[PDB]
Paper text:
We show here that Bacillus [name] is a bidirectional nuclease that can degrade RNA fragments from either the 3′ or the 5′ end. We have determined crystal structures of [name] [name] in its apo form, as well as complexed with substrates. These structures reveal a dynamic bi-lobed molecule with the DHH catalytic domain and the DHHA1 substrate binding domains connected through an extended linker.
To examine binding of larger nanoRNA substrates, crystallization of [name] with several di- and tri-nucleotide ligands were carried out. However, we did see a clear region of additional density between H284 and a solvent exposed phenylalanine from the catalytic domain (F162). F162 is structurally equivalent to W187 in Rv2873c, a residue observed to stack with the AMP adenosine at the 3′-end of a cleaved dinucleotide in a closed conformation of an Rv2873c monomer. Unlike the H103A:pAp structure, the H103A:pAA*A structure is in a closed conformation, suggesting that a longer substrate may stabilize interactions between the two [name] domains. Interestingly, ligand bound structures of [name] crystals soaked with a 3 mer pAA*A are observed only in the closed conformation (spacing of 12.2 Å between Cα of H284 and Cα of H104), suggesting that nanoRNA substrates may facilitate interactions between the two domains.
Numbering used by the authors: -4 to -1, 1 to 311
Amino acid sequence: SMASMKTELIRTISLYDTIILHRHVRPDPDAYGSQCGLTEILRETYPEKNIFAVGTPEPSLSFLYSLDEVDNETYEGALVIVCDTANQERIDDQRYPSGAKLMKIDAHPNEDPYGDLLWVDTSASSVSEMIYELYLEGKEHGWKLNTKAAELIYAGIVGDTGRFLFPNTTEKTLKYAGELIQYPFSSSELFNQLYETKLNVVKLNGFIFQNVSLSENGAASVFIKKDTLEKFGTTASEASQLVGTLGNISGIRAWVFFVEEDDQIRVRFRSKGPVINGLARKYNGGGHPLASGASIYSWDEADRILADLETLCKE
Ligand SMILES: Nc1ncnc2c1ncn2[C@@H]1O[C@H](COP(=O)(O)O)[C@@H](O)[C@H]1O
């Protein structure tokens, strides 16, 4: 059961003098909220321990918490905890298996079941929610949550659920958010910093909004070629990140972005209903029923994708 695993995690954390926490490369709010929220619980609870959070900062999330630089030596005999990383190959700072122990905490399917102690709960909204849950048990072992830690966990939850929009939001998620918002951090300032968007990514989004084609069957497309990328000064990853912004257009059922890179065209599939991971598979990609991707090599293939998207949507 989960109750037995949370208790073992807390017992194990108790034992180690030095604890170092990692999360995934290209961190998002949930990576910061889980890794740093837990770091901050442990610092507040165990002033005697040496606690570090490692990885390269994301400049847009750098306002939540600052990270540590640590020597290889520091790992000797350390407990290493990795948050919110489904695949060990995607862990930021690849020193994670070099301590005396390895603990994995994640909310994604346990396809890569690494670690000496594993707690993976796919029912959880986010790993930040999992950290709050662990704190609730830890409370009975003397754990203490301060204002910074509450703020971090709240940022993670709010980030990962699109502010209680997405289907990973549950009754627990909202309950815990109401407990967290009782701490005296400014929710409005947090939101303001999390949602701050570079002007040129804004302008690119406006190009995307003006240039979206919607068929009578609810199929939509946006082409983002090198010329457009260059005009707005936006990277291809910035463009791809905007794929979710079409979600509310009236009548939209499924859609694709085609984002040109140097050695491939990235394809990002999104849907309101009709399953699109087969379509991504058909073109050598894959992913979730409602969010998938592929990589193609000509504009001719893109037109084939479109055609297939019209068909799927029309059924
Ligand atoms: N080329 C690809 N091959 C396989 N899976 C992919 C590919 N691109 C995206 N995905 C998956 O599709 C889902 C949506 O991610 P993405 O659209 O890349 O942001 C995730 O589960 C990705 O791992």
